[PDB]
Curated annotation (Swiss-Prot):
GO MF annotations, alphabetized: hydrolase activity, hydrolyzing O-glycosyl compounds; peptidoglycan lytic transglycosylase activity
Keyword Transmembrane: no
InterPro entries: Lysozyme-like_dom_sf (IPR023346), Lytic_TGlycoase_superhlx_L_sf (IPR037061), Lytic_TGlycosylase_superhlx_L (IPR012289), Lytic_TGlycosylase_superhlx_U (IPR008939), Transglyc_AS (IPR000189), Transglycosylase_SLT_dom_1 (IPR008258)
Chief localization: periplasm
NCBIfam families: PRK11619.1
Keyword Disulfide bond: yes
Protein name: Soluble lytic murein transglycosylase
Catalytic activity: Exolytic cleavage of the (1->4)-beta-glycosidic linkage between N-acetylmuramic acid (MurNAc) and N-acetylglucosamine (GlcNAc) residues in peptidoglycan, from either the reducing or the non-reducing ends of the peptidoglycan chains, with concomitant formation of a 1,6-anhydrobond in the MurNAc residue
Family: Belongs to the transglycosylase Slt family.
Gene3D superfamilies the UniProt entry points to: 1.10.530.10, Bacterial muramidases, Lytic transglycosylase, superhelical linker domain
Tree of life domain: Bacteria
GO biological process: cell wall organization; peptidoglycan metabolic process
Length: 618
C-alpha cells in the first residue's frame, strides 16, 4: 500500500457512500485505517446512525481523536442526541462537564435539574438567560422549569427585556412582556406597544413611572424613531426629558442620537446649527469623528480645524487624525511640524503611512520580517499536519481551515511563523494567511500576501484594464485566499461574488458556461466572473481604484451618491476618509494598501495611488 493508493480508495469509498452502496463501503473501510483521513470516515459512520449509538462508542471516538475538529463538535452533538432520547442520567455520564455549544449547555443544565441538581441548574440557566439574543429552542424547557421553581429573580426577568430591547430583538421583548411576572404586569402592555412601534415612545414615557429601566427602554425606542424621522425625534427631546425627569447625561445621549441622523446632505440650516451645538456638548468620540468626516467630505477647512480639535486626546493618536493634523499644519505653513508627523507615520505599516510617503514625495519603505530559515518542526511532521495535507490535496479548504486552526492555536510566535511559511511553501495560500493572523505576524508581508492563483489572475486580466495586482488585492481582501468560503448572505469564493451579481455579470459580458452559484467555488470560474465585474465598475468610474473598490463593496449607486455629495471639492484621501459606511471605508483602505504590497511582490513600485487618482478632484 501507499499514500497514493489510499488516496484513490478514499475518493472511491466516498463515491460509493454517497450512492449508499454500503456493501462497497463495508468492504473498503478496514483497508483505509492507515490513511490520514480515516477518522473522518469513522465520524461519518458514527453519525450515520447517531440515534442508535451507545454512548461508549462516542466516548471512545472522542477520546481517540483529541485534535480532530469533528470529534470535538461531536461532544456537543451527542449531548443533544442524549437530550432527544430524554436520557438525562446518560447525558451527564457522557458529559459531566459543561459542553461547548449553547444548545448543548441548555440541555446539560436541564439534565442537572432532572437529576436533582436544581441549584446548579439555576446557576446555568441564569447565565444562559442574561442575553438579548434569542437562545436555542432547547433552552425553553430549562427557562420554564427555572421560573416554575420560584428561584428566578424577577429583576433577572426584567433585565432580559432590557437586553433584548437594546439588541433590537423586539420579538423577544414582546414574548417576554406577554409572559410578564405579576411584579411588572402593570407595564407589560406599554412595553409590547413600544416593541411593536417605537413611535409610542412619548406615550410610554408619560404613562409609566420613570426609572432606570423605563428610561433605557425609551432611549432605545427614541433611536428607532430618529432613524425613521430625525426631525420628529429632535423636536421630541424636551417632552421626553420632562416626562422622565432626565438628567444632563441622559439628555445629551438623546442629543447624540439625533445628531447622528443629521449628517446627510439634505439638512436645513436650523438642523445643522442644532446638530453642531449638540456635538459641541457631546462626549461621544465616534460622533465627533463622524462630524470630522463631514468636514473632510465637503472641503470645509475651518470645520476640519474646529472638529479635529474637539476629538479627545486618545482619538488623536489614530493614523487618520495624525495625517489630517499634518494636512492642516502644512496649509498653515508649519512645514517642520507637519513633516515630522508624516515621517513618523511612514515608519508604520498601512494605508496612512503610505499616504504620508506619497504626500511628501518619498518612497515608502516596506518592513518585511522573514520567517525562520528552518520551517520543519515536530508540528509539521505529525498526524494533524498529515490530515491537513490530505484535506488540501482534495481542495477541502473549509475542513482544512478547522484543522489548521487547532495546529496554530496556542503556539509560539516562532512556531506560528514556521507554520505560515510551511503553508506558503506548499502553496496553501489560505493557510499561510490564516497562520499570520493567528500569530499576529503583521510584518511578515510575504506570507500575508502570497501570489495566489498567479497564472489565472494574469490570464483573466490580460485583456482587461484592471491591473493583475489590483484583482489580487480585491480577492485577498474578500476571501483571504480561501476559494471555498461563503458568507452568511451567500457571497462565494475568492472574490466573494453574490449569485445575483454573477448572473448579471454573465449576461452583461456574454460569458459562457455558467449555470449555478455552486460553480463560484471553483477558482477559475470565480476569477473569470469576478474580474469581469471588477473591470465593469473600474471602466464605469474612469479607471479609478478608489471608486471601483467602493463600488465592488457597496454598489455603483452608493458611489454615485457619495461623488454627488463631495461634488469635486475634495482630494483623494479626503474622499476615502469621508466615505460614510465604515465597512466600505475600511475596505477601500485595505485594498489600496494590499495592491501596493502585491505590486511590490510582483517587482513593481508600490506607490499608493496613480498620478491620476492622486490629483483628481473628488
Amino acid at each position: 500500500d501507499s499514500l497514493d493508493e489510499q488516496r484513490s480508495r478514499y475518493a472511491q469509498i466516498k463515491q460509493a457512500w454517497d450512492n449508499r452502496q454500503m456493501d462497497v463501503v463495508e468492504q473498503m473501510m478496514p483497508g483505509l485505517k492507515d490513511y490520514p483521513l480515516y477518522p473522518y470516515l469513522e465520524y461519518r459512520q458514527i453519525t450515520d446512525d447517531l440515534m442508535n449509538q451507545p454512548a461508549v462508542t462516542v466516548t471512545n471516538f472522542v477520546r481517540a481523536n483529541p485534535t480532530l475538529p469533528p470529534a470535538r463538535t461531536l461532544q456537543s452533538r451527542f449531548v443533544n442526541e442524549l437530550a432527544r432520547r430524554e436520557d438525562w442520567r446518560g447525558l451527564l455520564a457522557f458529559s459531566p462537564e459543561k459542553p461547548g455549544t449553547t444548545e448543548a449547555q441548555c440541555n446539560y443544565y436541564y439534565a442537572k435539574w432532572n437529576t436533582g441538581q436544581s441549584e446548579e441548574a439555576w446557576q446555568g440557566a441564569k447565565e444562559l438567560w442574561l442575553t438579548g439574543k434569542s437562545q436555542p429552542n432547547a433552552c425553553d424547557k430549562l427557562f420554564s422549569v427555572w421560573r416554575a421553581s420560584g428561584k428566578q429573580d424577577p429583576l433577572a426577568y426584567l433585565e432580559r427585556i432590557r437586553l433584548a430591547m437594546k439588541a433590537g430583538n423586539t420579538g423577544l421583548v414582546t414574548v417576554l412582556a406577554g409572559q410578564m411576572p405579576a411584579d411588572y404586569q402593570t407595564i407589560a402592555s406599554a412595553i409590547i406597544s413600544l416593541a411593536n412601534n417605537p413611535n409610542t415612545v412619548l406615550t410610554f414615557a408619560r404613562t409609566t413611572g420613570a426609572t432606570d429601566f423605563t428610561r433605557q427602554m425609551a432611549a432605545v425606542a427614541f433611536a428607532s424613531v430618529a432613524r425613521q424621522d430625525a426631525e420628529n425625534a429632535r423636536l421630541m427631546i424636551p417632552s421626553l426629558a420632562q416626562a422622565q425627569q432626565l438628567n444632563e447625561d441622559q439628555i445629551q445621549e438623546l442629543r447624540d442620537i439625533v445628531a447622528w441622523r443629521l449628517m446627510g446632505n439634505d439638512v436645513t440650516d436650523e438642523q445643522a446649527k442644532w446638530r453642531d451645538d449638540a456635538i459641541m456638548r457631546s462626549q461621544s468620540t465616534s460622533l465627533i469623528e463622524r462630524r470630522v468626516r463631514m468636514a473632510l467630505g465637503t472641503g470645509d477647512r475651518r470645520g476640519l480645524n474646529t472638529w479635529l480639535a474637539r476629538l479627545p486626546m486618545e482619538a488623536k493618536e489614530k493614523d487618520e487624525w495624525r495625517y489630517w493634523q499634518a494636512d492642516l499644519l502644512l496649509e498653515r505653513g508649519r512645514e517642520a511640524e507637519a513633516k515630522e508627523i508624516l515621517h513618523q507615520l511612514m515608519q508604520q505599516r498601512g494605508f496612512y503611512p503610505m499616504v504620508a510617503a506619497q504626500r511628501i514625495g518619498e518612497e515608502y519603505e516596506l518592513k518585511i520580517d522573514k520567517a525562520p530559515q528552518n520551517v520543519d518542526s515536530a508540528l509539521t511532521q505529525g498526524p494533524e499536519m498529515a490530515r491537513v495535507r490530505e484535506l488540501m490535496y482534495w481542495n477541502l479548504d473549509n475542513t482544512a481551515r478547522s484543522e489548521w486552526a487547532n495546529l496554530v492555536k496556542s503556539k509560539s510566535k516562532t512556531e506560528q511563523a514556521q507554520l505560515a511559511r510551511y503553508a506558503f511553501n506548499n502553496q496553501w495560500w489560505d493557510l499561510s494567511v490564516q497562520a499570520t493572523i493567528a500569530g499576529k505576524l503583521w510584518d511578515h508581508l510575504e506570507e500575508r500576501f502570497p501570489l495566489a492563483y498567479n497564472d489565472l489572475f494574469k490570464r483573466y486580466t490580460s485583456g482587461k484594464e484592471i491591473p493583475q495586482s489590483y484583482a489580487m488585492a480585491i480577492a485577498r481582501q474578500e476571501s483571504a485566499w480561501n476559494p471555498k468560503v461563503k458568507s452568511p448572505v451567500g457571497a462565494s469564493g475568492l472574490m466573494q461574488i453574490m449569485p445575483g451579481t454573477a448572473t448579471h455579470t454573465v449576461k452583461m459580458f456574454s460569458i459562457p458556461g455558467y449555470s449555478s452559484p455552486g460553480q463560484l467555488l471553483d477558482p477559475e470560474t470565480n476569477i473569470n466572473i469576478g474580474t469581469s465585474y471588477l473591470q465593469y465598475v473600474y471602466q464605469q468610474f474612469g479607471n479609478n481604484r478608489i471608486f471601483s473598490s467602493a463600488a465592488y463593496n457597496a454598489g455603483p449607486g452608493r458611489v454615485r451618491t457619495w461623488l454627488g455629495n463631495s461634488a469635486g471639492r475634495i482630494d483623494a484621501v479626503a474622499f476615502v476618509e469621508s466615505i460614510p459606511f465604515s465597512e466600505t471605508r475600511g475596505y477601500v483602505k485595505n485594498v489600496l494598501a494590499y495592491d501596493a504590497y502585491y505590486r511590490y511582490f510582483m517587482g513593481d513600485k508600490p506607490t499608493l495611488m496613480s498620478a491620476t487618482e492622486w490629483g483628481r478632484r473628488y
